Ligand binder design. Structure first.
Ligand SMILES: COC(=O)c1ccc(C[NH3+])cc1
Lengths: 151, 151
C-alpha cells in the first residue's frame, strides 16, 4: 500500500522530467475519492501496470495515444488519449494550451490531481480544486504529490 | 473469449500495417501452449489490455519500450522490450535482421506465433515452429492469424 504510492509518485516524477526536458506535452490525471469512470471510457483502455517507461511512450508526439489524457485509477494506468472537461476559466493564462485547460476542467468537477507538461516551454503544472499551479520545480512537484497522493 | 482472439488479430493487423507503411521495426510474439514467462521477465512489464494503439506506441523508435520484443500472454500485452533468443540457423537469409533471427529463435523452442515488421523494407514476416513465412501479404497474414490464434 505504502509502496504503491511511492512507485506512483516516482513514476510520475521520472516520466514528467523526461518529457519536460524534451518539450513533450503530457496530461496525467490521477483520480482520488471522486471517480472518473465516464472519462476513462473516452480513451483507449489500457488497465496497465504503472511505469515511467510506459508513461513516456504514451505521450510521444504523432502517436495514437498522445492526443488526450492518461487517467490513473487504483494501481493501474486506466486509459490513455482520454478527454477531460475544458474549463471556461478567464484567469488561466492565454499562453497555456488545451492540455492545461483540460487539466483545469477536470479539477473543477473532481478531486483528482492532474499533472501537465507544456510542449511549448517544458514547464510542469498541477491542477486541483479548480486552480492551477504553474511551472513547478522538482521540489515543489514532489511536495504536492506527497501531500495529495499519500493517505 | 472468441472476441478477445479476433480483437487480438485485428490489433496485430492494424498495428503492423501502420508500422509497415512507416518502416517502423516491430517484433510481436504471441504465446500459446508453451509458456514464455522466462522471456517476459526480460522485458518491461505492462500487463496491459491489447489494442492496436498501444502496440504502435510501444514500437516508436528511440523510446523506452521499443528496444526488444512485445510478448502477448493470454489476453494481455505482458511485457515490452523483451529478449528473444537468436536462432543459429545458417539458412536464414543474410538480408534479414536481428528481429527475424530472434523471431526464428523463439519459434524453434516454443509454439508461439511471432510477427516481424522490417524497419528496412516494411515487409511483414511470420515465424512458427522453426519455419519463416517471409514478406506475407495482408490476406496471407490474416489467414495465418485466424488459423493459429482462433481456437
Ligand atoms: C511516497 O513516496 C515517497 O516517499 C517518495 C520519495 C522519493 C521519491 C524519489 N524522488 C519518490 C517517492
Amino acid at each position: 500500500i505504502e509502496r504503491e504510492q511511492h512507485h506512483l509518485i516516482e513514476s510520475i516524477e521520472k516520466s514528467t522530467q523526461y518529457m519536460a526536458k524534451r518539450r513533450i506535452g503530457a496530461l496525467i490525471s490521477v483520480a482520488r475519492d471522486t471517480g472518473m469512470d465516464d472519462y476513462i471510457e473516452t480513451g483507449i483502455p489500457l488497465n496497465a501496470k504503472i511505469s515511467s517507461q510506459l508513461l513516456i511512450n504514451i505521450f510521444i508526439p504523432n502517436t495514437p495515444l498522445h492526443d488526450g489524457a492518461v487517467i490513473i485509477k487504483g494501481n493501474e494506468i486506466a486509459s490513455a488519449a482520454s478527454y477531460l472537461p475544458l474549463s471556461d476559466s478567464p484567469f488561466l493564462s492565454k499562453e497555456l494550451g488545451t492540455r492545461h485547460r483540460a487539466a483545469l476542467g477536470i479539477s473543477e468537477v473532481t478531486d483528482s490531481i492532474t499533472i501537465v507538461v507544456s510542449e511549448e516551454t517544458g514547464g510542469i503544472s498541477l491542477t486541483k480544486g479548480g486552480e492551477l499551479f504553474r511551472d513547478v520545480s522538482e521540489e515543489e512537484l514532489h511536495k504536492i504529490l506527497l501531500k495529495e497522493l499519500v493517505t
